[PDB]
């Protein structure tokens, strides 16, 4: 499914945004990290983007550890 | 819908490089490959579409390999 996509762009969000981050910037971030993705991740990151982000701009706020934020959007089963 | 642009892709790489008349298995064969020749920025969404959708892909597949026909009946598209 969206479990490897999710933690690497999670995992580029985590290394490139600040730690107190306005859902503003999480958005903007988020929006624009699938094209820092390897290449053959970049379609089926938009599509995951897509899918999940009213829940990963909700959750990201709080937490942006790569694993626990995949897990909780059950993203990763 | 968020599948909807990779499955023609892949059902039209199939439909132009697979014979009308190919057994299951050699669908099977070819749609396991076909991910690896569409464009890189492809390759990680189609494997997940393919792994979602094979086994009525390869039911379909034998009567018709349209990609806008057979995308639109498995609910890929539109």
Redesign the interface.
């Given at each position: 499914?969206?479990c490897?996509?999710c933690e690497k762009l999670v995992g580029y969000l985590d290394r490139n945004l600040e730690k107190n981050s306005t859902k503003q910037e999480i958005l903007a971030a988020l929006e624009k990290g699938c094209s820092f993705l390897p290449?053959?991740?970049?379609?089926?990151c938009d599509?995951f983007v897509?899918?999940y982000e009213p829940v990963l701009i909700e959750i990201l706020v709080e937490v942006m550890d790569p694993s626990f934020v995949c897990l909780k959007i059950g993203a990763c089963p």
């Amino acid at each position: 499914g969206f479990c490897e996509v999710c933690e690497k762009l999670v995992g580029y969000l985590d290394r490139n945004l600040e730690k107190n981050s306005t859902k503003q910037e999480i958005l903007a971030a988020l929006e624009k990290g699938c094209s820092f993705l390897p290449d053959p991740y970049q379609k089926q990151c938009d599509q995951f983007v897509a899918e999940y982000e009213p829940v990963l701009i909700e959750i990201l706020v709080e937490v942006m550890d790569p694993s626990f934020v995949c897990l909780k959007i059950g993203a990763c089963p």
